[PDB]
Amino acid sequence: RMSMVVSGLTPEEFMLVYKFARKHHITLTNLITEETTHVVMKTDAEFVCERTLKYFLGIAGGKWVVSYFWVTQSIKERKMLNEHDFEVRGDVVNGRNHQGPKRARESQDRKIFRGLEICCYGPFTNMPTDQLEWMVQLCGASVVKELSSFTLGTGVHPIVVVQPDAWTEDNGFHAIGQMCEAPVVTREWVLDSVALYQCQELDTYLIPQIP
């Protein structure tokens, strides 16, 4: 049935969602899981939100990603206004009008990471690796833990995702192409890809690999 988590809300706001939840017998939880069906986002008048992990895992799961205005309107009209009319068009990074969650809900038989082996390599921040990993799996990638664990052959397409920030290194990420044969890119390829729910050409995200 219905199970929600919220993102970007204040307690009073959260208490309103609780109110909503109790009235409609909807489950409400702290952590987003398989079962989670809705992700309630803080947005602006025009349904743009910030990009939070829950935002991403929401889209990655093709769950309902709906503006907080869904809640308050329902309350304000003693009834559940269908999710359809409160979705988030976009975010403060990937554009105010990309229909991300929309697309996602509309393509679980063809996921942006069809035929991809991804290795999240090195350290990340604000987002634990396993969550980024979970993300890409929800999009149909296959997680690989070690650079050397890539499935050789051709059937598949390998990719190394890094986040330069969390590195404070010398010969670290400029030199990944030395220990494997895959394109290397920043986390932004994934997040951007998931936001728009369109598989983004590596072009813009590749990191300089030494020979």
Site membership for another protein, residue 198 (CB under 8 A): no
Site membership for another protein, residue 126 (CB under 8 A): yes
Whether 119 contacts 146, CB under 8 Å: yes
Closer to another protein by Cβ: residue 56 or 150: 56
In the shown chain, the binding pattern of residues 55 to 94 toward another protein, with x for contact by CB under 8 A and - for none, equals --------------------------------------x-
The stretch near another protein (CB under 8 A) out of 16-24, 46-54, 77-85, 196-204 is 46-54
Nearest distance from C-beta of residue 42 to another protein, angstroms: 10
Site membership for another protein, residue 164 (CB under 8 A): no
Separation of alpha carbons 17 and 9, rounded Å: 9
Amino acid at site 153: G
Separation of alpha carbons 62 and 133, rounded Å: 16
Separation of alpha carbons 83 and 4, rounded Å: 12
Site membership for another protein, residue 122 (CB under 8 A): no
Separation of alpha carbons 134 and 147, rounded Å: 18
- Tokens 């979705």 belong to 87
Site residues (CB under 8 A) for another protein?
7-8, 50-54, 93, 126-127, 187, 191
